[PDB]
Amino acid sequence: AKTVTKQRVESHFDLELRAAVMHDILDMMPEGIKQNKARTILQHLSEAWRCWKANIPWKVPGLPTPIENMILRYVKAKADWWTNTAHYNRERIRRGATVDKTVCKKNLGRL
């Protein structure tokens, strides 16, 4: 049972975020839904995250408000994780602590 060490961290976070969204949309759909359409909502969530990072205002013209609110909720959660990781690595790069070179490039790109 492999450990999430240092190079699995973002892939494990984005692995678990998808699972939480899957459980929420399986609980959120009412009783007579065809139980398809999970992949499309996951793509809407990935596109909403890209539009958050690009500072593009994200609005789908027809979309149910529980799905739209849930996507906004999880996009705010990934925003918080992204931003707090950026603050932490910037304080580390400022003090001179042991940092990777890739985390310096990633941190510049986030800042």
Partner 1 sequence: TAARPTFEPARGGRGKGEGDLSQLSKQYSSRDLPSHTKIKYRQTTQDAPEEVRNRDFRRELEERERAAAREKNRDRWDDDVVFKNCAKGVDDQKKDKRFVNDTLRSEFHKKFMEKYIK
18 counts as binding RNA under rule CB under 7 A = yes
Compute the half-sphere exposure of residue 73: CA atoms within 13 Å on the CB side of its CA: 11
Residues 27-56, interacting with partner 1 (CB under 8 A): 38, 42
46 counts as binding RNA under rule CB under 7 A = yes
Instruction: Identify which of 79, 86, 82, 84 has the alpha carbon closest to the alpha carbon of residue 103.
Output: 86
Options 8, 10, 12, 15; binder of partner 1; rule CB under 8 A? 15
Options 23, 37, 73, 76; binder of RNA; rule CB under 7 A? 37
